[model samples]
Target chain A: HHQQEALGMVETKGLTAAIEAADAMVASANVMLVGYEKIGSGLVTVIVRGDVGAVKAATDAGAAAARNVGEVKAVHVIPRPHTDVEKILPK
Target chain B: QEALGMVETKGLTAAIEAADAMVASANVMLVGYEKIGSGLVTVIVRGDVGAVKAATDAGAAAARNVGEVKAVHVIPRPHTDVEKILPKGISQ
Candidate 1:
C-alpha cells in the first residue's frame, strides 16, 4: 500500500498572508490545500498535501509570495509526517 | 463593584504568563480567556478597580517581556448584563 502524501506548511502573521501563500503554493504545483491553523495573535498557517518534490516547491513559492504581504513566520516540507499528525490535521 | 481587567497578547505563552503575573500581583481572579485568532489571546481578570488596575499593569508588563502584548485595559464595574455573555472559561 502507498504511504500518506507529503505535507507543505506556510505560517504567516495574518490571514491575508496565509491566503496569499496558499494561492501561490497551489498555483505553483499540483497540491491540495488541506487546511489551516490559527495559533493566536494573528498567526495563520496554511497546510497542503502532495508528493515531496511538489510540496517543497509549493512551500518555497508560498514563503516567497507570502512575505510580500505579511511576515512569513515559518515554512516546511514534511515528506511524511507521522500518522498521528495526519489524524489531527483538518481534512 | 467588580471590575474587569484584560491583557491581550500575541500568543498563548504570553497570555498565560500575563495571567499568572496578574493573579500573583493582586487580589484578582483569572476569570476568562478570549481568543480572537491570528495569534491574539486575551486574559481576563476580575476584582475591585484598584486591584484590576494593578493586575492589568503587571500582566501587560509580564506579557510584553515574553511576547507581543497587543492591548491592556481595565473596565471599572463593567455593565451587569455584560457578565452573562462571557465564554465558558470566564467566571461571572
Candidate 2:
C-alpha cells in the first residue's frame, strides 16, 4: 500500500467483455491482474495494478477490447491512489 | 412528474461532473449520492418523467468525458416502495 502504484479497472456488462478486458489489460502492459469482480446487474470489473504509464495504457487497451466484445460500462486508471483506497479497491 | 434517474460513476470527478449538468439541464431534484461500497457510486434525481430522462442523459454525457461512467438509467414510473426499500441518500 505504501509503494502506491497505479490501479486500473475496466467495467463491462457481460462475462465475455470482462475476460476480454482482463486479457487486453495484462497483454498490453506489465500490469498485474489482481482479480475480477461481479457487481450487481450482471456487471463485472477487472482490476490491475502497475506503474502509472503501464496502467494508463493497460486500461485504454482493455476498454477498447471490452467495448468490442460487449458493453463497456467504465474504465478507470487511478494514478497513485490514497493509502485508504487500497483497503477498499478490489482485491 | 414522479420519475427517477441515476448516473453511476467510478469516482467523484465524474459524479460531480454529472450532478452539475443534471440539475442545469432539467428541472429535477438532485438527490444525495448513494454508495454501495463497490467502488462505483451513484447520483440520483427525482422529478418529471421527461425531465428526469433529459437530466439523466445530460449528466451521463457530461460524466463520460471527465471520468469513468459505469452506467446510466431512468425509471419513468417507479414503484412507491421501490425507493423506500433501497438506500438512496438524502440531499440538502
Candidate 3:
C-alpha cells in the first residue's frame, strides 16, 4: 500500500523520496493499493490485497511509510478486492 | 443534478461563488437542494456538456473550500453517459 502521485508533482526529489520510502515499506510488506483524484487537497487511495496476517503487516507498513511522501492525512485498508481461492480453484 | 458536501464555511462560500460564476458565464442556474450531512450540498442545473462541466468544476471547487468533499453525483440526462455503461443485452 503506497501512493499514486508524487507529492503534488515535484518530479524528482519529492517523488523519489516517496518511492524510496514506500519501497522500503513494501520490501517487508504484504498488500498494495494505487489510485488518486484532484480535489483541491488531493486524495490518494491505496488498496492492499493479501492474507490477514500479511495484509495487516503491509497495512501498518504502508501507513508509516506513506508519511514521508506527502500529507497522508488518513489511510484505510477498507475491503478486500478479490479472493485467491476464487482465482485458483474451480467453481 | 449533483450531490456534493462541504464541512466548513470556506466550502459553502466557495460553492456559492462557483455557482454564481457558472450562471454568469454559461447561462446556467442551479437550485440548492437539501443537505445530506457532513455539510452536504445538492444542486440541479440544466445545460449542455460544456456548461455542465463548467458548473461541476465550480461546485467541486466550492466543496473543496470547506475542507473534504465526499462525492459528486452528476445526474446526466437521458442517453448522456448512461447508455454506454449499460450492457446492450440488458437494456430495455
Candidate 4:
C-alpha cells in the first residue's frame, strides 16, 4: 500500500530451487519476502514486495538462481496489483 | 534399508495416477507423497530394488499420461539417516 508497491513471485519445481531463488531475490534487492506458497506436486513459489524496479530486478535474480538448480515455472513482477489480488495474496 | 521410489509430478492427479500404477505393477508399498510447492508433488513407494525400479518406471509413464511429470528416482537401499527426513504417514 505504501510507495505504490510492486509484487513479484518466483515459482520453481522443488523446494531446493525455491530456497535458492528466495535467497537470491532478497539478497539482490530491497524487496521483502512475503512468504512462500506450496501448490502440490513439489512446486514452490516465493513471493516478494517492493518498489517496481526493485521487484523486477529481484525476481530476475531469483529466476536465474532457481534455473541453475531446478526448473522454473514462472517469474512474475506486477506493478500495482489490482485491489482484488490483495485479498488472496499470502500474508 | 528399503528401496525407495519417487515419482515427481506437477499436480496431484498425476501423482495419484503414478501411485496407483506403481502399486499395481509391482509389489511396492506406497510410502507416502510429498508436496514441494509450486504444484510440485511427489509420490513415494517402497519395495526391493528390482520391484522399486519396476514400479518407478510404470508410475512415471502413468503419471506422464495424466499430467506433467517433473522427475522420477529410485534409491536402492536408502540410508536410514535419510529416512529420518523423508515424509512419514498421512498427507493433506
- Which lDDT tens digits does candidate 4 get at residues B3-60? 7777888889999999899989547888777776667777877788999999999999
lDDT of 3: 0.38
Q: Candidate 2 - CAPRI tier? A: incorrect
**Model 2, runs deviating above 4 Å:** A1-4, A81-85, B1-92
Q: Rank by TM-score, highest first.
A: 4, 2, 1, 3
List the candidates' TM-scores in order: 0.49, 0.50, 0.34, 0.51
What is model 4's native contact fraction? 0.37
Note the B-chain TM-score for every model: 0.86, 0.86, 0.51, 0.88
Show where candidate 3 strays beyond 4 Å: A1-14, A32-47, A84-91, B1-67, B72-81, B84-92
Question: Tens digit of lDDT per residue, candidate 4, span A1-91?
Answer: 3555688999977754665677678778998777778767656788888888899999999899778767899999887754554455855
Model 4, position B38: C-alpha lDDT score: 68
| Candidate 1, A51-75: lDDT as tens digits | 7878889999999999999988667
Instruction: Give me the chain B TM-score of candidate 2.
Output: 0.86
Which of the two candidates, 3 or 4, achieves a greater TM-score against the reference?
A: 4
**lDDT, candidates in the order shown:** 0.75, 0.75, 0.38, 0.76
- Of 1 and 2, the candidate ahead on TM-score is 2
| Descending-lDDT candidate ranking | 4, 1, 2, 3
Better of 1 and 4 by lDDT: 4
lDDT of 1 at A90: 25
